[PDB]
Amino acid sequence: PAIPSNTDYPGPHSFDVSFQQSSATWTYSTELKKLYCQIAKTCPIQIKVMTPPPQGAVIRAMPVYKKAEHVTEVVKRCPNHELSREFNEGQIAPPSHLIRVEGNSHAQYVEDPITGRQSVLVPYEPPQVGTEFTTVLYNFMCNSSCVGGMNRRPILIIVTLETRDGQVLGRRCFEARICACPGRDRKADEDSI
Protein backbone atom coordinates (compact mmCIF):
# COMPACT_ATOMS: atom_id res chain seq x y z
CA PRO A 1 0.00 0.00 0.00
CA ALA A 2 0.98 3.74 0.16
CA ILE A 3 1.20 3.95 4.04
CA PRO A 4 4.24 1.80 5.04
CA SER A 5 3.41 -1.35 7.13
CA ASN A 6 4.93 -1.32 10.69
CA THR A 7 4.18 -4.98 11.64
CA ASP A 8 7.17 -7.24 12.42
CA TYR A 9 7.61 -9.86 9.59
CA PRO A 10 10.44 -12.35 10.27
CA GLY A 11 9.75 -13.90 6.83
CA PRO A 12 11.64 -16.77 5.20
CA HIS A 13 15.19 -15.74 6.38
CA SER A 14 14.07 -15.22 10.03
CA PHE A 15 14.97 -11.49 9.92
CA ASP A 16 15.50 -9.90 13.35
CA VAL A 17 16.90 -6.62 14.67
CA SER A 18 18.67 -6.37 18.05
CA PHE A 19 20.82 -3.89 20.02
CA GLN A 20 24.02 -4.66 22.08
CA GLN A 21 26.05 -2.26 24.31
CA SER A 22 29.84 -3.00 23.83
CA SER A 23 32.82 -1.40 25.76
CA ALA A 24 28.31 5.86 23.00
CA THR A 25 25.26 7.59 24.53
CA TRP A 26 22.39 5.49 23.11
CA THR A 27 20.17 3.14 25.16
CA TYR A 28 17.66 0.56 23.81
CA SER A 29 14.69 -0.66 25.89
CA THR A 30 13.98 -4.32 24.73
CA GLU A 31 10.74 -3.85 26.80
CA LEU A 32 9.35 -0.67 25.00
CA LYS A 33 11.15 -1.60 21.68
CA LYS A 34 12.44 2.02 21.86
CA LEU A 35 15.87 3.47 20.93
CA TYR A 36 17.00 6.60 22.85
CA CYS A 37 19.90 8.32 21.10
CA GLN A 38 21.60 11.68 20.46
CA ILE A 39 21.55 13.67 17.19
CA ALA A 40 24.27 12.69 14.65
CA LYS A 41 25.83 10.01 16.98
CA THR A 42 26.55 6.36 16.01
CA CYS A 43 23.69 3.91 16.73
CA PRO A 44 24.77 0.36 15.91
CA ILE A 45 21.94 -2.06 14.95
CA GLN A 46 22.45 -5.84 14.62
CA ILE A 47 20.72 -7.81 11.79
CA LYS A 48 20.20 -11.61 12.30
CA VAL A 49 19.15 -14.08 9.55
CA MET A 50 18.90 -17.94 9.70
CA THR A 51 19.24 -18.56 5.89
CA PRO A 52 21.15 -16.32 3.40
CA PRO A 53 19.03 -13.67 1.59
CA PRO A 54 19.16 -13.84 -2.25
CA GLN A 55 21.82 -12.17 -4.45
CA GLY A 56 21.40 -8.36 -4.42
CA ALA A 57 19.27 -8.21 -1.21
CA VAL A 58 19.26 -4.89 0.75
CA ILE A 59 18.46 -3.48 4.21
CA ARG A 60 16.33 -0.27 4.20
CA ALA A 61 15.66 2.04 7.17
CA MET A 62 12.67 4.39 6.84
CA PRO A 63 11.23 6.68 9.56
CA VAL A 64 7.40 6.90 9.82
CA TYR A 65 5.25 8.84 12.37
CA LYS A 66 3.84 6.44 15.02
CA LYS A 67 0.47 8.20 15.73
CA ALA A 68 -2.50 7.63 13.34
CA GLU A 69 -3.00 11.46 12.94
CA HIS A 70 0.58 11.92 11.59
CA VAL A 71 1.34 8.66 9.71
CA THR A 72 0.66 10.17 6.18
CA GLU A 73 3.30 12.90 6.72
CA VAL A 74 6.87 12.19 5.45
CA VAL A 75 9.41 12.24 8.31
CA LYS A 76 12.39 14.40 7.31
CA ARG A 77 14.72 16.98 8.87
CA CYS A 78 13.63 20.46 9.99
CA PRO A 79 14.61 23.41 7.77
CA ASN A 80 17.10 24.63 10.48
CA HIS A 81 19.07 21.30 10.25
CA GLU A 82 18.56 20.79 6.45
CA LEU A 83 20.05 24.26 5.64
CA SER A 84 22.80 24.41 8.35
CA ARG A 85 26.55 23.81 7.68
CA GLU A 86 26.49 21.61 10.85
CA PHE A 87 26.51 17.83 10.05
CA ASN A 88 26.14 18.68 6.31
CA GLU A 89 29.81 19.11 5.01
CA GLY A 90 30.76 16.38 2.45
CA GLN A 91 27.84 13.82 2.75
CA ILE A 92 26.40 11.38 0.16
CA ALA A 93 23.21 11.84 2.29
CA PRO A 94 20.90 14.58 1.03
CA PRO A 95 20.65 17.12 3.84
CA SER A 96 16.84 16.59 4.28
CA HIS A 97 17.18 12.82 5.17
CA LEU A 98 16.65 12.08 8.91
CA ILE A 99 18.36 8.63 8.67
CA ARG A 100 21.95 8.27 7.50
CA VAL A 101 24.22 5.22 7.32
CA GLU A 102 27.77 5.67 8.74
CA GLY A 103 30.76 3.73 7.38
CA ASN A 104 29.37 2.26 4.12
CA SER A 105 30.18 3.99 0.77
CA HIS A 106 27.44 1.71 -0.75
CA ALA A 107 24.56 3.50 1.14
CA GLN A 108 21.85 4.55 -1.39
CA TYR A 109 19.52 7.45 -0.43
CA VAL A 110 16.04 7.06 -1.96
CA GLU A 111 13.15 9.48 -2.19
CA ASP A 112 9.94 8.12 -3.76
CA PRO A 113 8.64 10.53 -6.43
CA ILE A 114 4.92 9.81 -5.44
CA THR A 115 4.89 9.17 -1.66
CA GLY A 116 7.82 11.56 -1.02
CA ARG A 117 9.15 8.92 1.47
CA GLN A 118 12.90 9.13 2.21
CA SER A 119 14.90 6.06 3.21
CA VAL A 120 18.44 4.72 3.12
CA LEU A 121 19.47 1.26 1.76
CA VAL A 122 22.67 -0.78 2.10
CA PRO A 123 23.50 -4.04 0.26
CA TYR A 124 22.89 -7.02 2.65
CA GLU A 125 26.29 -8.48 3.75
CA PRO A 126 26.58 -11.70 5.82
CA PRO A 127 28.33 -11.31 9.22
CA GLN A 128 32.19 -11.17 9.33
CA VAL A 129 32.89 -14.97 10.10
CA GLY A 130 32.42 -16.56 13.57
CA THR A 131 30.28 -13.39 14.26
CA GLU A 132 26.45 -13.86 14.62
CA PHE A 133 25.29 -10.45 13.32
CA THR A 134 25.51 -8.00 10.36
CA THR A 135 26.04 -4.55 12.03
CA VAL A 136 24.59 -1.37 10.38
CA LEU A 137 25.68 2.00 11.81
CA TYR A 138 22.83 4.60 11.73
CA ASN A 139 22.84 8.31 12.54
CA PHE A 140 19.58 10.24 13.31
CA MET A 141 20.00 13.85 12.17
CA CYS A 142 17.19 15.81 14.04
CA ASN A 143 16.00 15.85 17.69
CA SER A 144 12.47 14.45 18.23
CA SER A 145 11.65 18.03 19.48
CA CYS A 146 12.81 19.79 16.22
CA VAL A 147 10.29 22.61 15.46
CA GLY A 148 9.26 22.57 11.76
CA GLY A 149 10.24 18.88 11.65
CA MET A 150 9.19 16.01 13.93
CA ASN A 151 8.05 18.69 16.46
CA ARG A 152 7.90 16.20 19.43
CA ARG A 153 5.87 13.60 17.39
CA PRO A 154 7.05 10.03 18.04
CA ILE A 155 8.54 8.06 15.10
CA LEU A 156 9.12 4.40 14.26
CA ILE A 157 12.19 3.25 12.37
CA ILE A 158 11.05 0.55 9.89
CA VAL A 159 13.91 -1.78 8.91
CA THR A 160 13.16 -4.00 5.90
CA LEU A 161 15.06 -6.83 4.25
CA GLU A 162 14.24 -6.60 0.52
CA THR A 163 15.17 -8.14 -2.85
CA ARG A 164 16.94 -5.84 -5.38
CA ASP A 165 13.46 -5.20 -7.01
CA GLY A 166 11.83 -4.08 -3.70
CA GLN A 167 10.01 -7.30 -2.60
CA VAL A 168 9.85 -7.24 1.26
CA LEU A 169 11.56 -10.41 2.67
CA GLY A 170 11.55 -9.22 6.32
CA ARG A 171 10.49 -6.23 8.47
CA ARG A 172 11.23 -5.08 12.06
CA CYS A 173 10.14 -1.76 13.67
CA PHE A 174 11.29 0.14 16.80
CA GLU A 175 10.43 3.59 18.19
CA ALA A 176 13.28 6.22 18.12
CA ARG A 177 13.61 9.15 20.50
CA ILE A 178 16.42 11.59 19.56
CA CYS A 179 17.18 13.68 22.66
CA ALA A 180 19.96 15.26 24.78
CA CYS A 181 19.96 12.66 27.64
CA PRO A 182 18.74 9.25 26.38
CA GLY A 183 18.75 7.53 29.85
CA ARG A 184 16.70 10.42 31.32
CA ASP A 185 13.97 10.11 28.59
CA ARG A 186 14.10 6.26 29.03
CA LYS A 187 13.74 6.56 32.85
CA ALA A 188 10.77 9.00 32.49
CA ASP A 189 9.02 6.60 30.03
CA GLU A 190 9.67 3.59 32.37
CA ASP A 191 8.55 5.46 35.57
CA SER A 192 5.26 6.64 33.91
CA ILE A 193 4.81 2.82 34.56
Next chain:
Amino acid sequence: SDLGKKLLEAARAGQDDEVRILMANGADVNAADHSGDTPLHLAAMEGHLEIVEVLLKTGADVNAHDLEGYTPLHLAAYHGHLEIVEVLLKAGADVNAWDSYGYTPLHLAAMTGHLEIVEVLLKHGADVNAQDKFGKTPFDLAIDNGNEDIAEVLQKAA
Protein backbone atom coordinates in the same frame (compact mmCIF):
# COMPACT_ATOMS: atom_id res chain seq x y z
CA SER B 1 21.84 34.96 14.11
CA ASP B 2 24.69 34.40 11.55
CA LEU B 3 27.34 34.55 14.38
CA GLY B 4 24.96 33.05 17.05
CA LYS B 5 24.33 29.97 14.84
CA LYS B 6 28.08 29.70 14.13
CA LEU B 7 28.83 29.88 17.92
CA LEU B 8 26.14 27.18 18.68
CA GLU B 9 27.75 24.88 16.05
CA ALA B 10 31.37 25.50 17.19
CA ALA B 11 30.37 24.97 20.85
CA ARG B 12 28.72 21.57 20.12
CA ALA B 13 31.67 20.57 17.86
CA GLY B 14 34.43 21.51 20.38
CA GLN B 15 36.06 24.02 17.97
CA ASP B 16 37.94 26.04 20.66
CA ASP B 17 39.60 28.54 18.23
CA GLU B 18 36.32 29.15 16.30
CA VAL B 19 34.44 29.90 19.57
CA ARG B 20 37.23 32.35 20.60
CA ILE B 21 37.26 34.18 17.21
CA LEU B 22 33.41 34.25 17.16
CA MET B 23 33.26 35.90 20.65
CA ALA B 24 36.00 38.39 19.53
CA ASN B 25 33.79 39.29 16.46
CA GLY B 26 30.78 40.05 18.75
CA ALA B 27 28.83 36.69 18.68
CA ASP B 28 25.93 36.57 21.24
CA VAL B 29 27.20 34.26 24.10
CA ASN B 30 23.50 33.53 24.99
CA ALA B 31 22.38 32.73 21.40
CA ALA B 32 19.77 29.91 21.73
CA ASP B 33 18.88 27.29 19.04
CA HIS B 34 15.29 26.04 18.38
CA SER B 35 15.65 23.54 21.34
CA GLY B 36 16.46 26.59 23.56
CA ASP B 37 20.06 25.29 24.06
CA THR B 38 22.81 27.95 24.51
CA PRO B 39 26.46 27.47 23.53
CA LEU B 40 27.04 26.75 27.29
CA HIS B 41 24.43 23.90 27.16
CA LEU B 42 26.01 22.32 24.07
CA ALA B 43 29.65 22.60 25.33
CA ALA B 44 28.67 21.27 28.83
CA MET B 45 26.80 18.32 27.22
CA GLU B 46 29.67 17.40 24.84
CA GLY B 47 32.41 17.79 27.57
CA HIS B 48 34.26 20.83 26.00
CA LEU B 49 35.74 22.27 29.20
CA GLU B 50 37.84 25.13 27.67
CA ILE B 51 34.80 26.29 25.62
CA VAL B 52 32.67 26.20 28.82
CA GLU B 53 35.29 28.45 30.57
CA VAL B 54 35.46 30.89 27.57
CA LEU B 55 31.62 31.11 27.46
CA LEU B 56 31.28 31.73 31.22
CA LYS B 57 34.03 34.42 31.29
CA THR B 58 32.28 36.21 28.30
CA GLY B 59 28.90 36.34 30.17
CA ALA B 60 27.14 32.98 29.44
CA ASP B 61 23.95 32.57 31.61
CA VAL B 62 25.00 29.62 33.82
CA ASN B 63 21.32 28.81 34.76
CA ALA B 64 19.67 29.08 31.27
CA HIS B 65 16.93 26.39 30.82
CA ASP B 66 16.38 24.75 27.41
CA LEU B 67 12.90 23.54 26.20
CA GLU B 68 13.33 20.27 28.24
CA GLY B 69 14.12 22.38 31.39
CA TYR B 70 17.83 21.29 31.41
CA THR B 71 20.49 23.74 32.70
CA PRO B 72 24.11 23.17 31.59
CA LEU B 73 24.70 21.51 35.01
CA HIS B 74 21.95 18.90 34.21
CA LEU B 75 23.78 18.07 30.94
CA ALA B 76 27.31 17.99 32.50
CA ALA B 77 25.96 15.74 35.37
CA TYR B 78 24.08 13.29 33.03
CA HIS B 79 27.00 13.08 30.56
CA GLY B 80 29.63 12.53 33.31
CA HIS B 81 31.75 15.72 32.83
CA LEU B 82 33.07 16.21 36.37
CA GLU B 83 35.51 19.11 35.62
CA ILE B 84 32.60 20.98 33.93
CA VAL B 85 30.23 20.29 36.84
CA GLU B 86 32.90 21.90 39.15
CA VAL B 87 33.38 24.94 36.88
CA LEU B 88 29.57 25.45 36.54
CA LEU B 89 29.11 25.24 40.34
CA LYS B 90 32.02 27.71 40.90
CA ALA B 91 30.25 30.04 38.35
CA GLY B 92 26.98 29.98 40.46
CA ALA B 93 25.04 27.11 38.77
CA ASP B 94 21.80 26.25 40.73
CA VAL B 95 22.69 22.83 42.26
CA ASN B 96 18.94 21.96 42.75
CA ALA B 97 17.51 23.25 39.40
CA TRP B 98 14.74 20.84 38.16
CA ASP B 99 13.92 19.96 34.50
CA SER B 100 10.42 19.34 32.96
CA TYR B 101 10.18 15.97 34.89
CA GLY B 102 11.48 17.46 38.22
CA TYR B 103 14.91 15.81 37.74
CA THR B 104 17.73 17.62 39.54
CA PRO B 105 21.41 17.20 38.59
CA LEU B 106 21.81 14.77 41.59
CA HIS B 107 18.94 12.65 40.09
CA LEU B 108 20.76 12.57 36.72
CA ALA B 109 24.21 11.73 38.30
CA ALA B 110 22.56 9.01 40.47
CA MET B 111 20.67 7.59 37.44
CA THR B 112 23.90 7.45 35.30
CA GLY B 113 26.26 6.13 38.05
CA HIS B 114 28.62 9.20 38.23
CA LEU B 115 29.86 8.74 41.86
CA GLU B 116 32.41 11.66 41.88
CA ILE B 117 29.71 14.02 40.46
CA VAL B 118 27.22 12.86 43.12
CA GLU B 119 29.85 13.78 45.81
CA VAL B 120 30.56 17.29 44.36
CA LEU B 121 26.79 17.97 43.95
CA LEU B 122 26.22 16.98 47.64
CA LYS B 123 29.08 19.26 48.82
CA HIS B 124 27.26 22.18 46.97
CA GLY B 125 23.94 21.45 48.82
CA ALA B 126 22.19 18.98 46.42
CA ASP B 127 18.84 17.98 48.06
CA VAL B 128 18.84 14.13 48.78
CA ASN B 129 15.05 14.49 49.46
CA ALA B 130 14.20 16.10 46.05
CA GLN B 131 11.42 14.10 44.25
CA ASP B 132 10.90 13.85 40.45
CA LYS B 133 7.45 13.77 38.70
CA PHE B 134 7.22 10.08 39.87
CA GLY B 135 8.03 10.66 43.61
CA LYS B 136 11.57 9.23 43.19
CA THR B 137 14.64 10.53 45.09
CA PRO B 138 18.19 10.25 43.63
CA PHE B 139 18.64 7.27 46.06
CA ASP B 140 15.61 5.53 44.41
CA LEU B 141 17.00 6.16 40.86
CA ALA B 142 20.38 4.77 42.10
CA ILE B 143 18.64 1.58 43.46
CA ASP B 144 16.51 1.17 40.23
CA ASN B 145 19.61 1.41 37.95
CA GLY B 146 21.75 -0.80 40.26
CA ASN B 147 24.21 1.97 41.39
CA GLU B 148 25.11 0.75 44.93
CA ASP B 149 28.27 2.83 45.69
CA ILE B 150 26.03 5.95 45.03
CA ALA B 151 23.02 4.53 47.01
CA GLU B 152 25.23 4.05 50.18
CA VAL B 153 26.69 7.60 49.82
CA LEU B 154 23.16 9.19 49.42
CA GLN B 155 21.88 7.23 52.49
CA LYS B 156 24.78 8.45 54.77
CA ALA B 157 23.94 12.04 53.57
CA ALA B 158 20.17 11.55 54.43
